[PDB]
Amino acid sequence: MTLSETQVFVALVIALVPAILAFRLSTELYK
Amino acid sequence: ATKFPKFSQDLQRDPTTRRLFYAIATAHDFESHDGMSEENLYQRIFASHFGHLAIIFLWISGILFHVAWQGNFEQWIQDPLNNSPIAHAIWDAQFGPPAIAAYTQAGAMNPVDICYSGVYHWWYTIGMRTNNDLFMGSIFLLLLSSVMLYAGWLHLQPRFRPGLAWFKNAESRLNHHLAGLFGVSSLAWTGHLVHVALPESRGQHVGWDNFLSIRPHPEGLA
Amino acid sequence: DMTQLTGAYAAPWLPWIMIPLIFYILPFPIFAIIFLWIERE
Amino acid sequence: VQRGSKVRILRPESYWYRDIGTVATVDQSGIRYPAIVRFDKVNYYGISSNNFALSELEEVE
Amino acid sequence: TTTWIWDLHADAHDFDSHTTDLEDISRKIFSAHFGHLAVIFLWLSGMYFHGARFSNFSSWMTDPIHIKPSAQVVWPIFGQEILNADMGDGFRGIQITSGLFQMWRGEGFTHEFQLFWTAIGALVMAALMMFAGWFHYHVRAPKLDWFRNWESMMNHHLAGLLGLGSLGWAGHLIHVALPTNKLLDAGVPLEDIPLPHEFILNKSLMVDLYPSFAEGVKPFFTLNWSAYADFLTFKGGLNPVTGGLWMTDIAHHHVAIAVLFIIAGHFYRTNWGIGHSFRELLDDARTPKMLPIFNFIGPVGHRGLDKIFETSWHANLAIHLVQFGTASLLVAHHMYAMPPYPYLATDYATVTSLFTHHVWIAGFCIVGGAAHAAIFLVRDYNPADHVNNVLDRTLRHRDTVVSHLAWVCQFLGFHSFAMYCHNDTMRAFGRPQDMFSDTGIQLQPIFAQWVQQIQTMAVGGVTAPGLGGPVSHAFGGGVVAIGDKIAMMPIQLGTADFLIHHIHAFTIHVTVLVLLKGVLFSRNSRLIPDKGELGFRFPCDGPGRGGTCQVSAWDHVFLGLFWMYNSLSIVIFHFFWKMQSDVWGTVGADGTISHITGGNFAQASITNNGWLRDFLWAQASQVIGSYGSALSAYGLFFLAGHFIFGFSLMFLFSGRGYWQELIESIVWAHNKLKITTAIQPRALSITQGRAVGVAHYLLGGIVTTWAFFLARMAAIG
Amino acid sequence: TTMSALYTHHQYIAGFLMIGAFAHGAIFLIRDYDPEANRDNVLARMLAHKEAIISHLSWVSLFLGFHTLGLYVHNDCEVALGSPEKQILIEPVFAQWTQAFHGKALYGINSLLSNPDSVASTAWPNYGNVWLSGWLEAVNNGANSLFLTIGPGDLLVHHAIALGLHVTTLILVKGALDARGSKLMPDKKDFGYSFPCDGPGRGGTCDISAWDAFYLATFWMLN
Amino acid sequence: SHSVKIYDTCIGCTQCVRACPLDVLEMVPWDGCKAGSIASSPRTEDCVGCKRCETACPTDFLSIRVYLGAETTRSMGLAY
């Protein structure tokens, strides 16, 4: 079978970590 | 003048709509930027290369996630010649009922796209069998890309910014990329092929829970 | 199944909200934020 | 270098680089490009004669 | 250099580019016009000679329903004799689509010696034209006050050229063409047709066809004109034997316009006090003499405009090329819907080719009218003559004219073409009820449907009681069938016709926008304040001011040629699909009409996909499946037109700075083998590369449509 | 559909990386190239040889284009005029023998790995070419897609491909070697990689920069 | 603004000054050629970049060179 609803929500919560780390890389690269 | 773009003072004083278009097309030409020292050029390229690496890992992590969530990978590996790979689902609220019926294809119960990239045939050969295999592969690349975003931010910090002589070391890079990037990665890929991809091709499930028990060979390593 | 958009996958309400959010709810705030960034003096 | 000498241009920016030209006049006043050399092939904008310095010329006859 | 070779052929026929004396310019113009008349008479001599010697015209005149017209035979070299197709009647040749045979039958031609003596008369009159051009230039050339006599020129060309030309043709219709076509439509074979002088010598032979000829010319002088009402008739409709117009309506047409033109040729005052003068008509059109709705044109009005016509030949060429476009557009629209020649309307290859040719002739003439309007403003226009008149005031609100035109072009492009993109998207979604269609959201062209209902109610006979039948069967009435083939039937207008007509209004308004902005900004603009000092034709004024490429009035004619091509391609595509879908076809033995493409214009022409699939992909199967048959020259010309289109984009997309630096390396290799030439190899100029690119683009696209139109219609038409 | 999509994907990617190699090799010659640090070495040779490299690329471009299009239009006029056996059908004998030297016995020429007792087949000092007995079923089967059968229609398109490779190289090499200057514009290196023109003077200088040779070669790369 | 450079190959023919529609160029005394004068570009902030001066220069190669620089309202030629 395919993914469960708890598996999709885990991937959405984990993906906030490269969302934050791409924000701090973008603001460090410059304005 | 305007603040945008911060890298070109002559584009800041441009009073026309040419300022916005030329700021795009010169944004990644770092040498023509205002006050770009030649050592600061290499450090921003190095951190931009970590940003491009993380985009690549996020891209393949999304391909694995959308097949595991909305594809038919476990149904396709039963008979790959009579089945059709599903790329992802369709959500377009302007669809009419004949378009919904036309794209409800390949044995799916919702509108889907047929995958034509061949990633089903690639994951099947290297040993992926379940949607749980594709999910933890998608989570691992979701964290591997965040490591690449960390290393780009880290190697811009003042203690970890590499000097110019480190960037010009064309012997330490050509040795490490031949033996480590090209050699050790091709060695570790053989280690995946003989420990994982060859037993899953022969019906034996090898995962992270049982790979320390099952040998790749009956005459194991002797 | 054949008359409207459904989803036989986990959390089928997610494309019900994400495609409105990504494509026609959030872009005009993002275009306005980017517009204020490139016009500020 | 004087009038009646067919010279050969050494100027890389010129149209007649490595080409033969006929000296029309050579000034004696002290200006920076005295050698007036007339040419056979015209350039890209209708000019067949241009001033050169004596150090950018080599003689043929 | 090699630029001198191209510049000499471009500096050939513009005469004020030399020393500008108007009397000597007017003499070279007057004698060159005799030379162009000799070219037309030489070309007319060829069509009558190939019609007399290399045709199946005598065989076609026996039965014009089942015989295809041919007037070009091909020699048997290189295997090219495959193009000699069976026309019927055992004749092998190329099916002509000019419609010369239908023109010659309606004029009264019956044999191949009458076409021969017409070819000799055109060969004689071509030699008379190239003597009058020699005599009126090299011997006895007129002077400038003879050229400036507008009132004598207008009187002699209305009454003398057009009035006596159509009265003289009404003499040929009445005494030759009316009896010859009356006997042919009543089924009399061509041995028994009298030669056309026997309708004059044997006056009694025309009495039994028209009994009013026994009473002679006497009712004309006594104004008992209703005696003649059997060979000059106000009938309307089509002849049910031929499908052409009634020949007695054609004779009374060329009689009534003859009286109207000879009356028109007494309007102007020449030598006798009576008449209007051109200056008094132009000096009075101003405030406060105009209507109060036209108070905006101001107190000078048209007062300074007669000095334009005294001095500028380019400004008169601008008006006359526009009106030849107006005339040729009328020839296109009126000859399909009121077909004037016998057995023309059911020859579908000829009706296609005649509409398409005269549309294209008109579109080039309109661009030339705007081109020589810009040449007048750059070269011939003097601003001292035009202070606060209608020419000066137009140049003083050119920003309001161009920006209002630019808005209505954007309105017409959204509310015509983007509705097709709406329709493409709605059909792909499976929402046909959301389309702009006759079965979805209807856009009925109710004003054109109202005119069609008026044009039918007028004949009965609410407003024109004198007709029996309709003016055209395209407006209304019934189906005219010749040989179980549709000649003309009512053309229904729906949502597909509303949309394509607003496409035409869009593509014309943009073509006006390119050409009018080129004329109105030809002397100066806010970008280039001295643009008129740089000339009519120049590439740019450098990369500065952001870049000033294509600011000249010549380069707007260059851009206007593409937009004229885009406009007229959709016009002839609208014609070709709608006639095959809703007009042309076959009346079956049941009584039902089966059209060529089966009525698919209403549902398929409303999307871009339907134009791609049902028009372009489906109907091009004749031109691509023609290899190894007699239509194979169309298949070769189809791919040849595709080649020149792609070849033109090398000149349009690139610039000469690349090609000049490419040439120096080939000049280097030619110099190392000691084979240099004196004339120095240059790339084409910036204007030459634009002129070559637009000429090959238009040649490539038109030849492709010509091969596609003529291969399909020679197979199934 | 996947095999068609994957081939077209990676070939169009490869064509884009090829024209960017010449584009960034031309930016190098404008910005980073030092004529004194590279005196009389190989980079100094081609900049002095540049009228010979471009003229030799132009002859191969004109020879291939005249004769491939000439053969195609000749075969077009023969098939259209009802004589399809009058076509000029040159057999691709060089790549058919190259297919025989890889293991195809389909042409029957039986020599050197189309041969059973060849020294390249038996590997006489070794007899250890274990690949071969599995390899020859990949070549001599008709359902796979390695070493397909080629005919005269395959020769004409390989020469059209060679025409497209040589012209796209000719635009990019001439754009790189004339990037520092030509006789039309000798000081082009002080104007940069990308600029519009040098104005309508000197005959006209539209599309003269090295960037505009990238722009022209992108049409030829896609074609 | 643009950059207008005059090089020492100038023969002082005053043709670039006559060709300039923006009055960027003027002649100053030089004693470096036979005519005793050389072109100068004092009002280069008014230069639009039309390169009419380079079209008028008879020296091979040109003694006057225009380098298109930062775009201002004057150099873009905008009346609005």
Ligand code: CLA
């Ligand atoms: C052994 C140690 C080691 C390793 C593993 C690496 C690895 C890397 N370094 Mg290097 N580096 C090293 C030591 C090392 N470095 C040292 C000691 C120095 C100082 C001298 C440097 C200085 C340095 C600089 C300045 C930069 C790098 C960069 C990189 C990255 C190259 C970009 C890339 O992702 O291509 C990965 C390439 C491969 C995996 C091999 C590809 C081979 C071909 C093209 C394909 C063959 C594979 C196969 C056929 C395809 C199958 C795949 C398909 C089935 C999906 C890569 C991660 C660049 C970077 O991006 O930084 C973030 C960069 O700018 N390094």
Ligand code: CLA
């Ligand atoms: C009633 C007398 C008369 C007639 C029939 C014409 C006819 C013509 N003139 Mg006009 N002209 C006239 C009086 C006349 N003119 C007078 C009084 C003046 C001085 C004010 C001019 C000043 C003038 C100028 C400056 C020009 C003309 C031109 C023309 C031609 C128009 C362009 C064209 O190609 O037409 C279309 C052609 C036809 C419709 C075919 C019929 C024309 C035939 C072949 C002409 C020869 C036959 C014969 C002379 C006419 C019949 C008379 C005969 C029965 C006695 C046409 C031939 C132009 C031209 O082309 O010159 C060569 C031109 O530039 N005319």
Ligand code: CLA
């Ligand atoms: C009665 C009609 C008429 C007359 C008398 C003129 C007369 C003139 N025109 Mg005008 N013009 C016309 C119609 C006319 N034109 C039309 C219909 C257009 C729209 C296309 C124009 C657009 C136009 C422009 C843009 C210009 C002129 C110019 C001129 C002047 C010089 C012409 C010249 O030297 O070219 C000599 C003739 C040629 C060089 C022949 C080339 C024509 C094409 C490219 C070739 C023919 C293609 C062929 C049909 C396809 C077959 C291909 C096959 C053989 C392979 C001359 C006063 C020029 C001028 O100097 O004004 C100040 C100018 O720049 N005309």
Ligand SMILES: CCCCCCCCCCCCO[C@@H]1O[C@H](CO)[C@@H](O[C@H]2O[C@H](CO)[C@@H](O)[C@H](O)[C@H]2O)[C@H](O)[C@H]1O
């Ligand atoms: C340059 C020209 C400008 C063109 C402007 C076009 C703008 C959009 C046009 C729509 C306006 C007229 O559209 C008009 O709407 C009504 C109401 O839906 C349609 O009505 C039709 O379809 C709807 C479908 O639900 C039914 O309710 C109705 O029974 C039926 O008659 C008409 O077919 C249409 O003629």
Ligand code: SF4
């Ligand atoms: S690109 Fe060509 S046409 Fe445009 S300004 Fe430069 S030289 Fe003139």
Ligand code: SF4
């Ligand atoms: S570029 Fe134009 S404005 Fe500037 S100096 Fe030259 S001619 Fe004058």
